[PDB]
Design an enzyme around this catalytic site. Structure first.
Site, PDB file in Angstrom:
ATOM      1  N   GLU A  77      34.451  29.996  47.320  1.00  0.00           N
ATOM      2  CA  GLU A  77      35.289  30.055  46.115  1.00  0.00           C
ATOM      3  C   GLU A  77      35.751  31.476  45.897  1.00  0.00           C
ATOM      4  O   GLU A  77      35.125  32.425  46.361  1.00  0.00           O
ATOM      5  CB  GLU A  77      34.522  29.576  44.860  1.00  0.00           C
ATOM      6  N   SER A  82      33.639  51.238  46.728  1.00  0.00           N
ATOM      7  CA  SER A  82      33.506  49.899  47.286  1.00  0.00           C
ATOM      8  C   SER A  82      34.780  49.379  47.942  1.00  0.00           C
ATOM      9  O   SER A  82      34.716  48.535  48.808  1.00  0.00           O
ATOM     10  CB  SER A  82      32.989  48.922  46.230  1.00  0.00           C
ATOM     11  N   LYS A 124      33.125  43.719  50.845  1.00  0.00           N
ATOM     12  CA  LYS A 124      32.922  42.262  51.008  1.00  0.00           C
ATOM     13  C   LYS A 124      32.839  41.822  52.454  1.00  0.00           C
ATOM     14  O   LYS A 124      32.155  40.864  52.785  1.00  0.00           O
ATOM     15  CB  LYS A 124      34.024  41.496  50.286  1.00  0.00           C
TER      16      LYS A 124
HETATM   17  C1  LIG Z   1      34.263  36.839  41.217  1.00  0.00           C
HETATM   18  C2  LIG Z   1      35.391  36.560  42.232  1.00  0.00           C
HETATM   19  O1  LIG Z   1      36.662  36.732  41.626  1.00  0.00           O
HETATM   20  C3  LIG Z   1      35.293  37.491  43.436  1.00  0.00           C
HETATM   21  N1  LIG Z   1      35.386  38.935  43.038  1.00  0.00           N
HETATM   22  C4  LIG Z   1      36.433  37.093  44.342  1.00  0.00           C
HETATM   23  O2  LIG Z   1      37.233  37.901  44.725  1.00  0.00           O
HETATM   24  O3  LIG Z   1      36.608  35.916  44.611  1.00  0.00           O
END
Ligand SMILES: C[C@@H](O)[C@H](N)C(=O)O
Ligand SMILES: C[C@@H](O)[C@H](N)C(=O)O
Ligand code: NA
Ligand code: NA
Lengths: 384, 394
Positions: A104, A371, A82
C-alpha cells in the site's frame, strides 16, 4: 513481537500461519551466507551503497556550534532510504519462492520503492492506493506504471491510506502462498517492525564506521525524521547500546500542534490498535484513524512503529516536532548553503539539528539522517 | 590545442588573456597534490563517487546476446555526470582565487550542475539562459534559484543558447579577474575540451577497474550518448589505448535524419567554427536549431576530440531516434527498475540492438549518464497523447 507493551499481531486468525512462515524464513535467511551475498550485491551494484557521510562545513560554521554531518541516503537509487527495505523484503520473498509483491502507499513513495525492487527481481507487483491519493500523486502513479507495477485504486471508505491498508490485508489473506506483503515502515504485525528495522540498520552501521573514521569518536546526537519510523530506526539501532549517543526523532508538526493539522503520533496521539499493531496513533473519540497533515508528503502515516513507542517510554530516545514552516526554511537553507536539495521529510530533521547545533559546543557532533532528496518536492515548494 | 585539425582557439583578442591564464592555472593544479585531495574529497563525500557498475542481467537475458553492464552515473549527486565537471572547474576556479562562476545553459541541466557546485564551494553563480529556454524550462530555472544562483535571461537576437553563449563570453571578458566561465561539455576553445574530458575521465577509470573485478577482462564495446560529448569522453578516454575495446557514440536521430529534426552533428553536420572551436556543427552558414526528445542532446555541435576519434576510426558514431530512445526508457524501467535519462536512453537503445548481434559472454558497458526523474513530464505527455479529433487518450 513486543517492544515493552507495544507491538503484537492484531490480525485475523487466517494470517497467523503466514506470519509464522514469514518469521521462520526470516530467521533462517537473515544471517545466511547466500542471502547476504545477494543482498549486499544488489545494495552495492544496483542501489549504490554505501552512501557517504558528508560534513556540512558551511552550515556548521554559519550556525557556530556543533559539527553537522549528513548521512546521505538521498543518494540511494530512487532517492530515498525506502529502497533498502524494498530490496531486502523483495529478496526475502524471492528466497521464499514467492512470485508476487503487494504493498500500500499514500504519498506513492513506498509504492515506487516496491515497484523498483519488484522490477529488479522479476516479480509481479500490485500496489493498493486510495483513489484520492491516486488523483493527487500523478507523477508517482506514472512512475509505478513505468516500473511495471499495477496501481489498484481503492474507492471504498475514505479513499485514502487506511482503505488501501485494508485492501492489501484482504488480498494477502487470499494470496499469501505466492504473494509477499511488502510493508514499508517499521509498522504492521510482527515480524514486520523487526524485519524493516533490520533492513534499514545498514544506514546506522555505515554511519558509525564513517563517523569513527572522520572524527575518531561517536556522535553526541543523531537526528532523524519519523513517519512510521524506518529511517530513524535504521540510523538509531546500531547506536542504541552506546549510552552517550542521544537519539532524537522528529515528527511532523504541520500547521502547529494546536492546529489539528499535523502528523505527530508520539507527541499528540494515544495508544490504540491499527495495521495489526498496538502503538501510538492519531485516532478520534470513536477510535477511528484521523486524517493527518504535513507539507512533507511521506510524513502522512497516522501512527508510529512500536519500537519508537518503546524507546520513548524508556527515555532512550526523545521525540520532538518541527512545523511545515520550519521544514521549508531548512529545505531552502540546505539547498543554498550546501548545494543539497533535501526531501521535505528530511528537512524536518535538518531543521531540528540546526536548532540543536546552536546550543552545543563546537567539538560536539550531530549526525542527521538525510533520508531522501527533494527533486520530488519541487512542485510543492514552488506552489508555496 | 588540437585533435588532428579539430579544436583550437578561434576567438577575439579579448579572450586570449583569460584563456592563457586558465591554461596556466590548469597546468599548475591538475597534478597538484592538494587540489586533487580536495577534488577527490568532494567527489566522494558530496557527489557520492564511486558510482557502481551494474550487470543488467534481466535485460541481458531478455535480448539473449551479449552481457549489458551499466555505469551508473545516474546515481551521482544531482542525477547526472555533469556534476563531475562542475565540481572540478568550480574548485579549479577557487584555487585560482576566483569568487564567481558564470555559465550558459539551454536545457537548464548544466545551469543546475553549475549552481550546485557553486553552492558547495560558496561561490557567486550567474547563469545566462536564452529567454525562450527560460520560458520552456520553468523547473530548472526554479532549481537554480533554490541553489542560490541568479538566472540572467538573454533577450537579444534569437533568445536561445547561441545568444547566451555570446553574453556569457562578453561577461567573462569583462570580469575574468574574479570570475570563471564554467563550460559544461567537451567544447569551446582550448583548453576547455581537454579540461572537461579530464574531469570526466574518472568515469572510465572506475568502469575499467569495475569490469576487471566483475568479469576479469576488458569490455568488447563501450556505448555512450553524445551531445557535446563529455559523458562519452569520460568513459571512452581511459580505454582509447586498449586496442580491442570498441567505442561507440550515439547521437540524437530525433524525428529521423531525413526529417531535419535531429541533433546528429557527426553524422550529418559540417566542419566549421563555432564556440571558438573547429568541429562538426549543424548549420545552414549559421547555427540551425536542433531537436531531440532528450533535452540535453540539443547542442548544435560536438566536441573536437570526438571529431578526431571519428576521423581516425578509433570510435564509431551512430544515431538513435526519439522513438527508439523512448522504447529503451520504458524497457529499462520495467525490466531493471532503473528510470534512465532520455539522453542515456539513446545509449541503452543502441546497446540493446548491438547486444542481439553479439555472442553470449561478450561484454558491453553502457554509460548511464543520468536518471530520468527530470523527464517524467515529457514521457507522460507522449504516453497520454490525445489525437486532435478526440477528447481523451485512446
Ligand atoms: C505512509 C505512506 O504514505 C508512505 N510514506 C508511502 O509513501 O506510501
Ligand atoms: C547544450 C545545453 O543545453 C546543455 N545540455 C545544458 O543543459 O545547458
Ligand atoms: Na503519525
Ligand atoms: Na549535436
Amino acid at each position: 513481537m513486543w517492544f515493552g507493551e507495544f507491538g503484537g499481531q492484531y490480525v485475523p486468525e487466517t494470517l497467523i500461519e503466514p506470519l509464522k512462515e514469514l518469521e521462520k524464513a526470516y530467521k533462517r535467511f537473515k544471517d545466511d551466507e547466500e542471502f547476504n551475498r545477494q543482498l549486499n550485491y544488489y545494495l552495492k551494484t544496483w542501489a549504490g551503497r554505501p552512501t557517504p557521510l558528508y560534513y556540512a562545513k558551511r552550515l556548521t560554521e554559519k550556525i557556530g556550534g556543533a559539527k553537522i554531518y549528513l548521512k546521505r541516503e538521498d543518494l540511494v537509487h530512487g532517492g530515498a532510504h525506502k529502497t533498502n527495505n524494498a530490496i531486502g523484503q523483495a529478496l526475502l520473498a524471492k528466497f521464499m519462492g514467492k512470485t508476487r509483491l503487494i504493498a500500500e502507499t499514500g504519498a506513492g513513495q513506498h509504492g515506487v520503492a516496491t515497484a523498483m525492487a519488484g522490477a529488479l527481481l522479476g516479480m509481479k507487483v500490485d500496489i493498493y492506493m486510495g483513489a484520492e491519493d491516486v488523483e493527487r500523486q500523478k507523477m508517482n502513479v506514472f512512475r509505478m506504471k513505468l516500473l511495471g507495477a499495477n496501481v489498484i485504486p481503492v474507492n471504498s471508505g475514505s479513499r485514502t491510506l487506511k482503505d488501501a491498508i485494508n485492501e492489501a490485508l484482504r488480498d494477502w489473506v487470499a494470496t499469501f502462498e505466492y504473494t509477499h506483503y511488502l510493508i514499508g515502515s517499521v509498522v504492521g504485525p510482527h515480524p514486520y517492525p523487526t524485519i524493516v528495522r533490520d533492513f534499514q540498520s545498514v544506514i546506522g552501521r555505515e554511519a558509525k564506521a564513517q563517523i569513527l573514521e572522520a572524527e575518531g569518536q561517536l556522535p553526541d546526537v543523531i537526528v532523524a525524521c519519523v513517519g512510521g519510523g524506518s529511517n530513524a530506526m535504521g540510523i538509531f539501532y546500531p547506536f542504541v547500546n552506546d549510552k552517550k549517543v542521544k537519539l532524537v526523532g522528529v515528527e511532523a508538526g504541520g500547521k502547529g500542534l494546536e492546529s489539528g493539522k499535523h502528523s505527530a503520533s508520539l507527541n499528540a496521539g494515544q495508544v490504540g490498535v491499527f495495521h495489526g499493531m498496538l502503538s501510538y496513533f492519531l485516532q478520534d473519540e470513536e477510535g477511528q484513524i484521523k486524517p493527518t497533515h504535513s507539507i512533507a508528503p511521506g510524513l502522512d502515516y497516522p501512527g508510529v512503529g512500536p519500537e519508537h513507542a518503546y524507546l520513548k517510554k524508556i527515555q532512550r530516545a526523545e521525540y520532538v516536532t518541527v512545523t511545515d514552516e520550519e521544514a521549508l526554511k531548512a529545505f531552502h537553507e540546505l539547498s543554498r548553503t550546501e548545494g543539497i536539495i533535501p526531501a521535505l521529510e528530511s528537512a524536518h530533521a535538518v531543521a531540528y539539528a540546526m536548532k540543536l547545533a546552536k546550543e552545543m559546543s563546537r567539538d560536539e557532533i550531530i549526525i542527521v539522517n538525510l533520508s531522501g532528496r527533494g527533486d520530488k518536492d519541487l512542485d510543492i515548494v514552488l506552489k508555496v
